[PDB]
Amino acid sequence: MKVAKDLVVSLAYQVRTEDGVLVDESPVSAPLDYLHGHGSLISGLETALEGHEVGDKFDVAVGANDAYGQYDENLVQRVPKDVFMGVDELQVGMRFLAETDQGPVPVEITAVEDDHVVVDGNHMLAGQNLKFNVEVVAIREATEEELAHGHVHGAHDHHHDHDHDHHHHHH
């Protein structure tokens, strides 16, 4: 069975930016629990997750418009033109990958002053894409209650495991 609406699934994803830096993560040990087609997480991910079945693993790239990654003014700064020695001509409207304190940062020049240029990683609303490495743990058709409420009805465990056994389970 594949992931679709009113089905509920537990998936394990890792979200990092185009810069390479990790922002958040749901481990394979404990998934993100959500009811699909209800808007449980973000915009781009659910639809990307769709069609897949448990065990599928792949990285997804969704723009900040449909994911996280909203405007951050810490991502905009003024860099001395000297650093961009390899660049042809530091002009406004120019896009290039820039190596920075924070790794390679895909920015666009919005101005070029006397000695430094102005680049903002946030273009339209932000624009930077996020990369999610998704690991769909399980998929289940919901119990109606989950649908009626709009989310999972018994996802969070009270310990870790229940069926711990040290006997001969085969008989």
Short mmCIF file of C-alpha atoms in Angstrom, two decimals:
data_model
loop_
_atom_site.label_atom_id
_atom_site.label_comp_id
_atom_site.label_asym_id
_atom_site.label_seq_id
_atom_site.Cartn_x
_atom_site.Cartn_y
_atom_site.Cartn_z
CA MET A 1 0.00 0.00 0.00
CA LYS A 2 1.19 3.50 -0.81
CA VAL A 3 0.98 6.73 1.15
CA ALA A 4 -2.14 8.76 0.38
CA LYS A 5 -4.86 10.84 2.02
CA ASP A 6 -6.44 9.76 5.35
CA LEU A 7 -3.70 7.18 5.64
CA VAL A 8 -1.32 7.77 8.51
CA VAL A 9 2.41 7.19 8.31
CA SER A 10 5.57 7.33 10.32
CA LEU A 11 8.61 8.52 8.42
CA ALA A 12 12.12 9.42 9.46
CA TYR A 13 13.69 12.39 7.78
CA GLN A 14 16.75 14.56 8.01
CA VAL A 15 16.47 18.20 7.02
CA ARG A 16 19.53 20.14 5.97
CA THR A 17 20.04 23.15 3.73
CA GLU A 18 21.67 23.54 0.33
CA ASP A 19 24.60 24.88 2.34
CA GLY A 20 24.98 21.39 3.76
CA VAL A 21 24.26 22.29 7.38
CA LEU A 22 21.71 20.24 9.35
CA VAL A 23 18.75 22.14 10.81
CA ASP A 24 16.50 19.38 12.20
CA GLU A 25 16.07 15.60 12.11
CA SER A 26 13.67 12.80 12.95
CA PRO A 27 15.77 9.64 13.47
CA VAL A 28 15.13 6.14 12.14
CA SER A 29 14.75 5.09 15.74
CA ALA A 30 11.73 7.32 16.22
CA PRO A 31 9.79 8.57 13.19
CA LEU A 32 7.73 11.67 12.56
CA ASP A 33 4.12 10.65 13.01
CA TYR A 34 1.57 12.44 10.86
CA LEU A 35 -1.74 11.93 9.06
CA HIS A 36 -1.26 12.47 5.35
CA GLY A 37 -3.43 14.90 3.45
CA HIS A 38 -4.16 16.97 6.51
CA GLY A 39 -1.15 19.31 6.47
CA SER A 40 0.71 17.74 9.36
CA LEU A 41 4.23 18.86 8.38
CA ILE A 42 5.10 21.09 5.42
CA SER A 43 3.89 21.76 1.89
CA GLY A 44 6.43 20.17 -0.43
CA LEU A 45 7.28 17.11 1.63
CA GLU A 46 3.89 15.42 1.97
CA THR A 47 3.27 15.57 -1.79
CA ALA A 48 6.81 14.30 -2.44
CA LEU A 49 6.27 11.49 0.06
CA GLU A 50 3.11 10.54 -1.81
CA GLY A 51 3.14 7.50 -4.05
CA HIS A 52 5.95 5.93 -2.03
CA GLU A 53 5.77 2.85 0.16
CA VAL A 54 7.56 1.98 3.39
CA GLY A 55 11.30 1.41 3.22
CA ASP A 56 11.85 3.98 0.48
CA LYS A 57 14.75 6.29 1.15
CA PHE A 58 15.66 9.36 -0.84
CA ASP A 59 16.55 12.97 -0.38
CA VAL A 60 14.02 15.61 -1.26
CA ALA A 61 14.66 19.21 -2.19
CA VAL A 62 11.91 21.72 -1.56
CA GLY A 63 12.09 25.49 -1.64
CA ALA A 64 11.54 27.52 1.53
CA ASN A 65 8.18 28.54 0.03
CA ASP A 66 6.84 25.03 0.51
CA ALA A 67 9.04 23.97 3.40
CA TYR A 68 10.87 25.59 6.29
CA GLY A 69 13.67 28.04 5.62
CA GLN A 70 11.79 31.31 5.96
CA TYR A 71 13.49 34.72 5.79
CA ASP A 72 16.61 34.97 7.93
CA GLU A 73 18.51 38.24 7.86
CA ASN A 74 21.54 36.47 9.34
CA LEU A 75 21.90 35.01 5.86
CA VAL A 76 22.32 38.44 4.27
CA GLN A 77 25.62 40.31 4.67
CA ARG A 78 28.18 42.49 2.89
CA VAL A 79 31.23 40.71 1.55
CA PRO A 80 34.46 42.45 0.37
CA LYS A 81 34.86 42.18 -3.41
CA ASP A 82 38.42 40.91 -2.94
CA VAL A 83 37.15 37.56 -1.67
CA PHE A 84 35.33 37.03 -4.98
CA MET A 85 38.59 37.17 -6.93
CA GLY A 86 37.43 34.26 -9.09
CA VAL A 87 34.19 36.00 -10.05
CA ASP A 88 34.09 37.64 -13.47
CA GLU A 89 32.33 40.84 -12.51
CA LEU A 90 30.56 41.47 -9.24
CA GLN A 91 27.33 42.91 -10.59
CA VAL A 92 23.83 43.28 -9.21
CA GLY A 93 21.45 40.46 -10.06
CA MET A 94 24.34 38.02 -10.34
CA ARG A 95 23.98 34.57 -8.87
CA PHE A 96 26.82 32.33 -7.78
CA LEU A 97 27.71 29.79 -5.14
CA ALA A 98 29.79 31.52 -2.52
CA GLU A 99 32.02 29.88 0.01
CA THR A 100 31.51 31.37 3.45
CA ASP A 101 31.82 30.83 7.20
CA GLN A 102 28.70 28.75 6.84
CA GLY A 103 29.97 26.71 3.91
CA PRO A 104 28.91 27.27 0.30
CA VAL A 105 25.98 29.64 0.28
CA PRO A 106 24.04 30.22 -2.97
CA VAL A 107 23.48 33.98 -2.91
CA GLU A 108 22.54 36.76 -5.28
CA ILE A 109 24.05 40.21 -5.47
CA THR A 110 21.57 43.01 -4.81
CA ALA A 111 24.17 45.78 -4.83
CA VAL A 112 27.83 46.47 -5.31
CA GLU A 113 29.34 49.29 -3.32
CA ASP A 114 32.84 50.78 -3.42
CA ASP A 115 34.69 47.78 -2.02
CA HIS A 116 32.06 45.20 -1.04
CA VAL A 117 28.89 43.74 -2.48
CA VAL A 118 25.52 43.05 -0.94
CA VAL A 119 24.20 39.50 -1.16
CA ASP A 120 21.08 38.08 0.36
CA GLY A 121 20.41 34.37 0.53
CA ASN A 122 16.75 35.24 0.87
CA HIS A 123 15.47 36.01 -2.62
CA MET A 124 11.68 35.99 -3.08
CA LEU A 125 10.59 35.13 0.48
CA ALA A 126 13.77 33.24 1.22
CA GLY A 127 14.15 30.92 -1.71
CA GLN A 128 16.79 28.63 -0.24
CA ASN A 129 15.82 25.00 -0.66
CA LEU A 130 15.88 22.40 2.06
CA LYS A 131 17.04 18.86 1.57
CA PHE A 132 15.22 16.16 3.43
CA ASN A 133 16.52 12.63 3.50
CA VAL A 134 13.33 10.69 4.00
CA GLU A 135 13.02 7.19 5.35
CA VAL A 136 9.41 6.02 5.34
CA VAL A 137 9.17 3.67 8.32
CA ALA A 138 5.57 2.52 7.94
CA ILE A 139 2.22 3.30 6.32
CA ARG A 140 -1.23 2.47 7.71
CA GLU A 141 -4.83 3.27 6.81
CA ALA A 142 -6.19 5.29 9.73
CA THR A 143 -8.75 4.21 12.28
CA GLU A 144 -11.33 6.86 11.32
CA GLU A 145 -10.68 8.40 14.75
CA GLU A 146 -7.36 9.66 13.49
CA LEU A 147 -9.20 11.17 10.53
CA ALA A 148 -11.99 12.60 12.68
CA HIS A 149 -9.40 14.23 14.94
CA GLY A 150 -6.94 15.13 12.18
CA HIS A 151 -3.87 13.33 13.52
CA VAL A 152 -2.53 10.05 14.91
CA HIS A 153 -4.30 8.62 17.94
CA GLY A 154 -1.55 6.46 19.40
CA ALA A 155 1.87 7.21 18.00
CA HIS A 156 3.91 8.24 21.02
CA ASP A 157 5.17 5.23 22.96
CA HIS A 158 5.39 5.10 26.74
CA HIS A 159 8.79 3.37 26.96
CA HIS A 160 10.66 2.17 23.87
CA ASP A 161 9.33 -1.31 23.27
CA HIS A 162 6.77 -3.71 24.74
CA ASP A 163 7.45 -7.13 23.29
CA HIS A 164 10.86 -7.66 24.86
CA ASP A 165 11.39 -11.40 25.05
CA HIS A 166 14.28 -13.60 26.13
CA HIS A 167 12.62 -16.97 25.57
CA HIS A 168 12.19 -19.16 22.50
CA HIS A 169 9.56 -17.21 20.58
CA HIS A 170 9.36 -19.93 17.95
CA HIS A 171 7.22 -22.86 19.05
#
